Amino acid sequence: QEHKPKKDDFRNEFDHLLIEQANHAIEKGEHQLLYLQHQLDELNENKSKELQEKIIRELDVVCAMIEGAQGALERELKRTDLNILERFNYEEAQTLSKILLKDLKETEQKVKDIQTQ
């Protein structure tokens, strides 16, 4: 009926596999992106400077950690080869990650676009 989330937030990655990390990061990113993006909508109504600051600050810190791990992971996972499936999956991960990063800076564009006091 109702799917409870992950009870332990400070839980370390169990699988820790190249593609597993990628799908793990994007799952977290997706959830936080949609979260802050809905907050953008609220911010857009409040036009609150402090709210703007919190939103852009949390966006920034998550965007940075995501990009750092993504860049690292991409470089590493590239050591894998000879596998039509892995090729497809890698390319697919790159596809979704790029979309995710786009949406981050897109939301960034929105928060920076709202004039505050």
Swiss-Prot record:
Record key words, sorted = Allergen, Coiled coil, Signal
Provide the tissue specificity: Midgut and hindgut contents as well as fecal pellets (at protein level).
The coiled-coil regions, if any, are 1-96
Q: Which domain of life is it from?
A: Eukaryota
Give the GO terms filed under biological process for this record: protein homotrimerization
Any keyword Signal? yes
- Which InterPro entries does the entry link to? Mite_allergen_group-5/21, Mite_allergen_group-5/21_sf
Entry's Gene Ontology molecular function annotations: protein homodimerization activity
Q: Gene3D superfamilies in the record, alphabetically?
A: 1.20.58.970
Give the UniProt family note: Belongs to the mite group 5 allergen family.
Quaternary structure annotation from Swiss-Prot or TrEMBL: May exist as homodimer and homotrimer.
Protein name in UniProt? Mite allergen Blo t 5
